Design a protein around this nucleic acid. Structure first.
Ligand SMILES: [Mg+2]
Ligand SMILES: [Zn+2]
Ligand SMILES: [Zn+2]
Lengths: 1336, 79, 99
RNA sequence: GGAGAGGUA
């Protein structure tokens, strides 16, 4: 029906139009006869009848009289639903101001009338007069006055000038203004004189003004004159049932304001003294303010318990507001709640269900089936029958359940898998059984976690469940292709124990004719479950085109492995079942099985895996005993030695030979060494303890100690826990982060003494508190994240572009942190790659890089690839399929319609809980050395000294693919040149990390040019040694005498003329800065590359929070704003000044630099844009504006993925790239051209992108935009749809602005569609929604 | 019994329109007085429609053809 | 262990009550809405937050349909949205639906 | 119906 929503102001006329009467009495209810009052706050004649088709006086009480009114009550005989839709109005004796439009921050009234808010508040609160016109006299349009000022002004100038005080005066001012005329005047004024801050102020004011005329709103409407009132039913008066009623504070606010209004009415009738009416008007204004929004004034109001009342402005804000409480999340019928148990006998696609809950839920279906069977020819008898659950009803239930899925949910549902469909199976219990494998997906322990049950009613819901949410359809995490049904902890133990081998077990060396014989032998007990035996088997290899070629062989394995092989499906290599089968092995096995034989074989194989694992784990009887905690024998000796070692250091400090801090550090170091030794010793003594005769004399093997089996298998616990159990549990850190010198030397097999346990308790409490706060914050983070990227849906197939990004394997100075093969897996190419047979088209330019092509790349050792990203897709209000890539939830390209944004947000947000809250180059491989960004010279020793900063060293292998990479520090000596051969362990470079030299380039004399002792330099000759030394002073250190001169040293020669820079015609002179200590002399030879002088020198979840929020850093390492030569200007005006000058372009750009910044460059250097001028963090906004988009996005993804992988969590880059695309969704105009956009306008990037695009089809020139980046919390607010923002936080701010703008929402986003409850244009509903869109 | 939908998705490689076409068929079957094309085994209508989709004898195109044909028959049945 | 098929109804907003003390129903929370959005599931979400909870006439006729063995629904509009609309209009804001 | 206190995952 309706399509759009419109919002604007309301004139008092319109308010009356809505109204169905006027309220006049603050009385509500008689408390003796519970009918309402005559025309009180509740009333029938105004609102409507209380009972359906019932006159209040009951003169007529039947539907026959529908339409008529009573003559005793004037009440309309009709339904009582009218009592939920009728609105009354209140005639306010005096004008009053609307609180929102006053303290909006910015205040629309304030800046509109252009008065400081303080003055306005003074006027409105009856403490300062203000002239309306004040013409024909000394006064101006809107001069203010105090009280004495006002009386004096009227005394001296008792002429017609008028100065009022309050809402009436404000209303007169507003209504007495011409908008468009002021608009013209203000635009002319802002034309120039002056764009310093008046630029911003005038632009904003003109924006508001042109907005006003653009809407059909009149400014004076901000001043309330008639007050609407809510329908009575929406503020119902619930009885407390003790003969009294509840509070219902809204009604108290209403009665209070009514009392003020009537009191003022009386006083005005009586023409009381002006002081009294002024006080009462102030009181009424305050009451109105409280009603609209209590608390924004300096003092809220409370009835009892000192708790502020609930204003209308409170019914919307916060979690309890309607949006987030009843309008976005709701309670729902047809639901259940219970505890959960395992019941491992279930299939993966079904779950247990109690009889009682099942019977309760499906009651309507039961009624329908009973009536169809005819056993109950009514609903009441049927209800009776089900109420007493005759035996028949149970088979009916079984019939109804036959193929009806249901939904299971766990409370903290982070990611998509947190809720899933299942088929039900009835059970005579009261606990929901649950197939154990899904527990990992639900992250659901059985320590008493509860689950909730829902049922899909309509047919389409059932089909959606079966075809999308069935458990068997969700096996790969969307975050990454990794499976998500890993045999978690017990089955894995069983399997690992199965696929082991004792050196000499019962029934060894014999031969078998197939796994069935192995099973029979083991069941008869004639052989141990794991002993080496040769057995014949048959592999099935489908290398042919979908043709399973069988091939037999006689392998040699252990009986347990052979028995296990019976389960695996046809097409797999037997080698996959020939190892110890750790957890990783099982996961990889499942992954490969799915990748080869599709879906169904994989799931059935998993079920059999689980069954067998449980059976044989139970058979194993692997228990834990105290004897298993084997303490290493040498531990005591090691500890004693370490203690004796500590003693000598303590002695050395006693004599004072050593300081305290070094004592502390060495103590810690030796303690760590001893602890490591103990750990290693116990681990060795444990893992290989088993020594067994082999039927020869003796041997050894891996151990069967239950603890080690559990640990190595990966079922539970890393090495750290077992170390604590057996070995000393290391050092503990005290609250402030310090580490206690004395470690805990006791393990848990032994008992800790008091103090040790005390310290450990401290640590554990720290951990627990951190966990609590971490989850608390992570919830908020993810809530923010999803809000900003909920509108994005793939809606196209191909946008038809060629831009992309060069995906390359990540290097961190060290090895490959992640090979290229996994960064590009499953993303279409932009431009075809050419093999290193260059001119060899290896792949097409628009093919999907599935596994085989990745293998092709790997065997061809490709370095970097142009891949189509999502940040550049040319689709408007969406993204074409190719720009995205594969689904990553199933092996094929993404479908058309998917809501990728939401799943990406969920994938990013879910893992947050696991995070934490609070010299020389030594190459190590033989290969070719290569160097990039090389601006270097040869020094006196023949080695190579660099003079560029971003110089980078690569070690490439013989084939030619890069293998290692390292950052070259500035001014580092290098043994080699470029393109040499290095040996493993060959130190290739060295440098000083401490001080900064004044390295030169060429040999010759050095002359102290423009250096006079007294005002430029000081003769601070070294006294310890006696060599010549003179120090150039800083600006502050130098006296005023030598400020104008610029000390420098120009390379000279014997003849005395200046030497020339190599290559360029400019003369060579190093400008010595302040505090330039020079030990050289005048006219003295120095060789190439020599220091002429010397000058001295978080990662937690909040890191991600800030980075996505795009908050600026503490110390922003300034960058090269543009290219060109650098120079200085007026100095020490609190800071230095710098000016850049292009070779030819203009050069108005200068900057003011804090004195603390150690600029590495000098004025004599021409520098290109982007180059670091200071050192430290970097601001993304400048990165964008100076290096386009592909730079900022790459930086962001690198940073975030670094943080994530540091903790060991796998996430695909697409989910981040989509976020970035949303982040940078805006733009700002630089030049309209033939467009129609004002200059400073910030406009949606899409609108301009299509406007210019179509204008060029005409002979018109578009505009010149410039993209922009915003924190998510800002971008989510600067969205076309205002409802989406309103459901988000700070409803008042967005809503007031939108109402003033008179915005008009069209509802094509998701969240809003949810609000109004219609099919989402995302999933299945996408087809219908697009179809309906096409219908118009 | 029905445990997977992989074959149906193979017949219709989108996984969304599958739901809609199956729903329309099952709606014809349940409230509309129609009959199945596969021998049912005491199974509900949704699974039956899904199996029909699986065997490929019913897809969106054939459904459009059938609805148009029966519409023409009804328009020819009024006389 | 608790269940509810169809019980009472909150007064100001027409939704199922909460808590075991009353015969209330569960709360389909916001995160679960997100999760359903993540799947392609659209119909089920729409029904769950339109006819199973809020729209009076929708659920009445749905009850009749279910009794009559005809699984179909008529969405209509949530009442709580009208509640929000009236509440906003109580302020000086004139808000409404277009054509 | 709303407040406050406590408690579970
Ligand atoms: Mg638990
Ligand atoms: Zn009457
Ligand atoms: Zn694209």
């Amino acid at each position: 029906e309706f399509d759009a929503i419109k919002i604007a102001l309301a004139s008092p006329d319109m308010i009356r139009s809505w109204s169905f009467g006027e309220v006049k009495k603050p009385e509500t209810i008689n408390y003796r006869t519970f009918k309402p009052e005559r025309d009180g706050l509740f009333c029938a004649r105004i609102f409507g009848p209380v009972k359906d088709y019932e006159c209040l006086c009951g003169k007529y009480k039947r539907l026959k009289h529908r339409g008529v009114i009573c003559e005793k009550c004037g009440v309309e005989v009709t339904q009582t639903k009218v009592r939920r839709e009728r609105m009354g109005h209140i005639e306010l004796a005096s004008p009053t101001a609307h609180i929102w439009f006053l303290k909006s921050l910015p205040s629309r009234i304030g800046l509109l009338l252009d008065m400081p808010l303080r003055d306005i508040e003074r006027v409105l609160y009856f403490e300062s007069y203000v002239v309306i016109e004040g013409g024909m006299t000394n006064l101006e349009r809107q001069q203010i006055l105090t009280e004495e000022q006002y009386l004096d002004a009227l005394e001296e100038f008792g002429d017609e000038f008028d100065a009022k005080m309050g809402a009436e005066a404000i209303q007169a001012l507003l209504k007495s203004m011409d908008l468009e005329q002021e608009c013209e005047q203000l635009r002319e004024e802002l034309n120039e004189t002056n764009s310093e801050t008046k630029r911003k102020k005038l632009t904003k004011r003109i924006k508001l003004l042109e907005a006003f005329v653009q809407s059909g709103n009149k400014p004076e409407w901000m001043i309330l004159t008639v007050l609407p009132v809510l329908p009575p039913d929406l503020r119902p008066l619930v009885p407390l049932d003790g003969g009294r009623f509840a509070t219902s504070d809204l009604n108290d606010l209403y009665r209070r304001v009514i009392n003020r209004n009537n009191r003022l009415k009386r006083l005005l009738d009586l023409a009381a003294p002006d002081i009294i009416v002024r006080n009462e008007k102030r009181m009424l204004q305050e009451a109105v303010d409280a009603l609209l929004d209590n608390g924004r004034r300096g003092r809220a109001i409370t009835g009892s318990n000192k708790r502020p009342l609930k204003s209308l402005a409170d019914m919307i804000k916060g979690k309890q507001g309607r949006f987030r409480q009843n309008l976005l999340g709701k309670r729902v019928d047809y639901s259940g709640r219970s505890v959960i148990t395992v019941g491992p006998y279930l299939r993966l696609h079904q779950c247990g269900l109690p009889k009682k809950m099942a019977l309760e839920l499906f009651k309507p279906f039961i009624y329908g089936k009973l009536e169809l069977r005819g056993l109950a020819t009514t609903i009441k008898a049927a209800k009776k029958m089900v109420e007493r659950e005759e035996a028949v009803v149970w088979d009916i239930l079984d019939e109804v359940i036959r193929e009806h899925p249901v939904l299971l949910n766990r409370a903290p549902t982070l990611h998509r898998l947190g809720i899933q469909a299942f088929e039900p199976v009835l059970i005579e219990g009261k606990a929901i059984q649950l197939h154990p494998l899904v527990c990992a997906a639900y992250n659901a322990d059985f320590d008493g976690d509860q689950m909730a049950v829902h049922v899909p009613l309509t047919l389409e819901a059932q089909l959606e469940a079966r075809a999308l949410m069935m458990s068997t359809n969700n096996i790969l995490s969307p975050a990454n292709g990794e499976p998500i049904i890993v045999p978690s902890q017990d089955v894995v133990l069983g399997l690992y124990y199965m696929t082991r081998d004792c050196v000499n077990a019962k029934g060894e060396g014999m031969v078998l004719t197939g796994p069935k014989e192995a099973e029979r032998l083991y069941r008869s007990g004639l052989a141990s479950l794991h002993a080496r035996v040769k057995v014949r088997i048959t592999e099935y290899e489908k290398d042919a085109n979908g043709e399973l070629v069988a091939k037999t062989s006689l392998k040699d394995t252990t009986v347990g492995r052979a028995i296990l092989w019976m389960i695996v499906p046809k097409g797999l290599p037997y080698s996959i079942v020939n190892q110890a089968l750790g957890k990783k092995a099982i996961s990889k096995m499942l992954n490969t099985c799915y990748r080869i034989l599709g879906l169904k074989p994989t799931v059935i194989f998993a079920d059999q895996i689980m069954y067998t694992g449980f059976a044989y784990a139970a058979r194993s009887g692997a228990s834990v005993g105290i004897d298993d905690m084997v303490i290493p024998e040498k531990k005591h000796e090691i500890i004693s030695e370490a203690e004796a070692e500590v003693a000598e250091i303590q002695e050395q400090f006693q004599s004072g030979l050593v300081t305290a801090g070094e004592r502390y550090n060495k103590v810690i170091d030796i303690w760590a060494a001893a602890n490591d030794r103990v750990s290693k010793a116990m681990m060795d003594n444990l893992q290989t303890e088993t020594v067994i005769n082999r039927d020869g004399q003796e041997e050894k093997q891996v151990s069967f100690n239950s603890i080690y089996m559990m640990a190595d298998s990966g079922a539970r616990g890393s090495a750290a826990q077992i170390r604590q159990l057996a070995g000393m549990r290391g050092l503990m850190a005290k609250p402030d982060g310090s580490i206690i010198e004395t470690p805990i030397t006791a393990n848990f097999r032994e008992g800790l003494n008091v103090l040790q346990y005390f310290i450990s308790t401290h640590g554990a409490r720290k951990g627990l508190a951190d966990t609590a706060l971490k989850t608390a914050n992570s919830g908020y983070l993810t809530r923010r994240l999803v809000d900003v990227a909920q509108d994005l849906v793939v809606t196209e197939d191909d946008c038809g572009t060629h831009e992309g990004i060069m995906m390359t394997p990540v290097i961190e100075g060290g090895d490959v942190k992640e090979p290229l093969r996994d960064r590009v897996l499953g993303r279409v190419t932009a431009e075809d790659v050419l093999k290193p047979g260059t001119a060899d088209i290896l792949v097409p330019r628009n093919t999907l890089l599935h596994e085989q092509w990745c293998d092709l790349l790997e065997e061809n050792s490709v370095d970097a690839v142009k891949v189509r990203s999502v940040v550049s897709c040319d689709t408007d209000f969406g993204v074409c399929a190719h720009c995205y890539g594969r689904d990553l939830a199933r092996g094929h390209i993404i479908n058309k319609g998917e809501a990728i944004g939401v799943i990406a947000a969920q994938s990013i947000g879910e893992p947050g809980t696991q995070l934490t809250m609070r010299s020389s180059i030594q190459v190590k491989n033989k290969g070719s050395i290569k160097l990039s960004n090389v601006k270097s010279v040869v020094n006196s020793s023949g080695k190579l000294v660099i003079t560029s900063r971003n110089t980078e060293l690569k070690l490439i292998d013989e084939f030619g693919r890069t293998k290692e990479s390292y950052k070259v520090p500035y001014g580092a000596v290098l043994a080699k040149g470029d393109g040499e051969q290095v040996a493993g362990g060959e130190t290739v470079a060295n440098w000083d990390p401490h001080t900064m030299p004044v390295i030169t380039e060429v040999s010759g004399f050095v002359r102290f040019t423009d250096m006079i002792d007294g005002q430029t330099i000081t003769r601070q000759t070294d006294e310890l040694t006696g060599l010549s030394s003179l120090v150039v002073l800083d600006s502050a250190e130098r006296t005023a005498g030598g400020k104008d001169l610029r000390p420098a040293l120009k390379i000279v020669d014997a003849q005395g003329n200046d030497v020339l820079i190599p290559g360029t015609d400019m003369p060579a002179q190093y400008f010595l800065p302040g505090k330039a200590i020079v030990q050289l002399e005048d006219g003295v030879q120095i060789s190439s590359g020599d220091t002429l002088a010397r000058i001295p020198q978080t990662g937690g979840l909040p890191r991600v929070a800030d980075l996505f929020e795009a908050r600026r850093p503490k110390e922003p390492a300034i960058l090269a704003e543009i290219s060109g030569i650098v120079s200085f200007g007026k100095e020490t005006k609190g800071k230095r000044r710098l000016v850049i000058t292009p070779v030819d372009g203009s050069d108005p750009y200068e900057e003011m630099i804090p004195k603390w910044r150690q600029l590495n460059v000098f004025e004599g250097e021409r520098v290109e844009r982007g180059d670091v001028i200071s050192d430290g963090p970097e601001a993304p906004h400048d990165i964008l504006r100076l290096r386009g988009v592909h730079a900022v996005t790459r930086y962001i993804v690198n940073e975030v993925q670094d943080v994530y992988r540091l903790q060991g969590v796998k996430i695909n880059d697409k989910h981040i790239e989509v976020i970035v695309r949303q982040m940078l969704r805006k733009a700002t105009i630089v030049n309209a051209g033939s467009s129609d956009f004002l200059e400073g306008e910030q406009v949606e990037y899409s609108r301009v992108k299509i406007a210019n695009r179509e204008l060029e089809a005409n002979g018109k020139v578009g505009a010149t935009y410039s993209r922009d980046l915003l924190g998510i919390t800002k971008a989510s607010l600067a969205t076309e749809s205002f409802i989406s923002a309103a459901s988000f936080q700070e409803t008042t701010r967005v809503l007031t602005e939108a109402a003033v703008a008179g915005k008009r929402d069209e509802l094509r986003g998701l969240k809003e569609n949810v609000i109004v409850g219609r099919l989402i244009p995302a999933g299945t509903g996408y087809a219908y929604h697009q179809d309906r869109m096409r219908r118009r | 019994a029905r445990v997977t939908v992989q074959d149906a998705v193979e017949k219709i490689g989108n996984r969304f329109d599958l739901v809609l076409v199956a729903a329309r068929r099952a709606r014809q079957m349940q409230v509309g007085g129609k009959d199945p094309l596969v021998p049912e085994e005491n199974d509900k209508t949704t699974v039956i429609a899904l199996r029909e989709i699986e065997e490929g004898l019913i897809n969106n195109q054939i459904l459009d053809v059938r609805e148009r044909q029966e519409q023409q028959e009804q328009e020819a049945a009024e006389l | 262990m608790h269940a509810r098929s169809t019980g009472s109804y909150s007064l100001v907003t027409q939704q199922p009550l909460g808590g075991k003390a009353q015969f209330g129903g569960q709360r389909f929370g916001e995160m679960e809405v997100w999760a359903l959005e993540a799947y392609g599931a659209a119909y089920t979400l729409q029904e769950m937050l339109t006819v199973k909870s809020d729209d009076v006439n929708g659920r009445t006729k749905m009850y009749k349909n279910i009794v009559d063995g005809n699984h179909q629904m008529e969405p209509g509009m949530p009442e709580s949205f009208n509640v929000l609309l009236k509440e906003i209009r109580s302020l000086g804001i004139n808000i409404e639906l277009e054509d």
